[PDB]
Design a binder for this molecule. Structure first.
Ligand SMILES: [Zn+2]
Ligand SMILES: [Zn+2]
Ligand SMILES: [Zn+2]
Ligand SMILES: [Zn+2]
Lengths: 150, 123, 76, 76, 150
């Protein structure tokens, strides 16, 4: 009952070479379970926010994607109320050459470029389309409230 | 084991790229700088290293020096250890043969560049 | 000037660039080294997905900065 | 037992062998590492061109010996 | 202002890691010109012999073969009176992935496995075919006479 070699090396390297704005650390009692914090992108409504995520490496990793959820509430067309992320690299566009590090950088990318035309949170997206400036200021307020001092 | 070079000019990876040349492979998995192989094939249509008739050939992307499989993360020695091969796709991306096999069970796009898709390389 | 790119594997490459290079121009250099077509590359900096048409100068990307590469992605 | 082969580039590889291995068996192991088919390999030791059917024992090739690889050649 | 890089490296390596039974040293006057001595193969009629050769790296090297000639007289079906060598890797079967070191090893191979069926020295080859044991003792005597103490 030991981890694939991939998880061991990938984990050493992740910690060896941290990325600015991203913190990801395995749970001491569970090497498949990662505590994550990501900074909101700069020049986004999420800027200045610190967003908690969980990441889980399922049994078929890296042939299957990490399972990933927001734990910090966020206002975004492709994330729902329960913090689930609809994102093609976590499903059909996964590649085994992607890794924890680049999954997390892709989530940031997703915050910097939301896609309300193909949404997960229908109300959020409807706001985003029909009144983008307002949807943006809502994201900024939710960022202050939930994703600062947390 | 370590750093790749061209058996014809004998330049290592650094010297090859220094002046615009690429690292290439033949179908038979033999590796050269682009210009040495271009100029051999003007002269004869046989692989310099193994003398197979070569018609096609392509760039491989290994930058740095010390080769490994991006999927399992085993380096050169660990891969051969267990009778896996180093393999390149037509788009020049390298994996161990087990990981590319397994990956193609699920996707049949290159894990590194997503081009729809190979052969052993000998380094 | 030099900037660094953390490629998919975690290895860092060094690119020679100008503040006026577009993100497209930077992708073309990465294609030469990595074999990944521009259409599949995304370049991440300060958490931002950089846009092809804009330049390094516009994003305040100065010498010695590190860009992070991921594959094309899409919210759904 | 181990012997060494100085391959075409000058690099030395290490092969795991038995005194009863034929030169053909040795060529097979070289093919795995080098991708050169047996029909194109010649193995030189003490100046001589080793014959496929004969064994390492027959040529007195002991552990830690080094064989030298060249391509198929022919006097004319 | 110099040699191709190939020639420089190739020359440093020769002198770095000598091959038993082969000596090859560039001329002070010309880095393309190599003084060579090869030992006769073991268990050949040439055994114990020391055979002088010259080797020249022409301008198109390594796309063309080194030019190579025996300076020591030798009794062999594929070498003539003037020390010229008919050998396919010096012509049609050259490869630029061959080198000085492996050219010279291939010449030793040729001494170890003569080819009288496709000869350069016709009268030598005729002896080799119709009376091989005698042709072999002639090679041994010529080895003593020309290729020892020389
Ligand atoms: Zn070359
Ligand atoms: Zn080949
Ligand atoms: Zn692998
Ligand atoms: Zn590819």
């Amino acid at each position: 009952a030991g981890l694939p070699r991939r998880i061991i090396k990938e984990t050493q390297r992740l910690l060896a070479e941290p990325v600015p704005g991203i913190k990801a650390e395995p749970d001491e009692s569970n090497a498949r379970y990662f505590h994550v914090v990501i900074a909101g992108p700069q020049d986004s409504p999420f800027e200045g926010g610190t967003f908690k995520l969980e990441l889980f490496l399922p049994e078929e990793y890296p042939m299957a994607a990490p399972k990933v959820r927001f734990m910090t509430k966020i206002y975004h067309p492709n994330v729902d109320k329960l913090g689930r992320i609809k994102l093609d690299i976590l499903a059909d566009k996964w590649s085994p050459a992607l890794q924890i590090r680049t999954v997390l950088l892709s989530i940031q990318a997703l915050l910097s470029a939301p896609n309300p035309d193909d949404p997960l949170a229908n109300d959020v997206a409807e706001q985003w389309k029909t009144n983008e400036a307002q949807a943006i200021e809502t994201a900024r307020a939710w960022t202050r409230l939930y994703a600062m001092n947390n | 084991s370590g750093t790749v070079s061209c058996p014809i000019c004998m330049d290592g990876y650094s010297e090859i790229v220094q002046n615009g040349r690429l690292i290439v492979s033949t179908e038979c998995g033999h590796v050269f700088c682009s210009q040495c192989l271009r100029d051999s094939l003007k002269n004869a249509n046989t692989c310099p290293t193994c003398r197979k008739k070569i018609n096609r050939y392509h760039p491989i992307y290994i930058g740095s020096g010390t080769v490994s499989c991006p999927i399992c993360m085993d380096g050169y020695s660990e891969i051969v250890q267990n009778g896996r091969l180093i393999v390149s796709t037509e788009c020049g991306h390298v994996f161990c043969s087990q990981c590319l096999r397994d990956s193609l069970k699920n996707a049949n796009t290159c894990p590194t560049c997503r081009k729809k898709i190979y052969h052993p390389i000998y380094i | 000037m030099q900037i660094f790119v953390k490629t998919l594997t975690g290895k860092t490459i060094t690119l020679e660039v100008e503040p006026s290079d577009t993100i497209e121009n930077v992708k073309a250099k990465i294609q030469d080294k990595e074999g990944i077509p521009p259409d599949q590359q995304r370049l991440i900096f300060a958490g931002k997905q950089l846009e092809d048409g804009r330049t390094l100068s516009d994003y305040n990307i100065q010498k010695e900065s590190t860009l992070h590469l991921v594959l094309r992605l899409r919210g759904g």
